[PDB]
Amino acid sequence: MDRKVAREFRHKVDFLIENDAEKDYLYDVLRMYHQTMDVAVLVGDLKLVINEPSRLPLFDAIRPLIPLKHQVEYDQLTPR
């Protein structure tokens, strides 16, 4: 069974980001977030790069990939 969001994720990131280097930055954060398992560091870096309010919507696709319980905490950490 696929995830579905995966497809939309690629399209979203590409549309919002549109950059090659930027895309690698996000992919790197996730790749490390898996082994590191640190939501604190993830949100931090994601902010420095996705700080642009225009990129905020990107967080939507980020949740799906992120663990369930992690999603809840993701919102608890990410302010507004």
Q: What size, in residues, is the chain?
A: 80
Q: How was this structure determined?
A: NMR
Q: Which domain does 16 fall in, by range?
A: 1-80
Task: Provide the Cα torsion 31, 13, 65, 54; round to 10°.
Answer: 110
Total domains in the chain come to 1
Q: Which two tokens stand for residue 45?
A: 């870096």
Say which CATH number the domain at 34 has.
1.20.1160.20
Question: Using CA atoms, how far apart are residues 60 and 8, in angstroms rounded to an integer?
Answer: 10
CB–CB of 33/42 below 8 Å?
yes
Which of 80, 69, 76 lies closest to 40, judged by CA?
A: 76
Collapsing DSSP to helix, strand or coil, 71 comes out as helix
Identity of residue 32: M
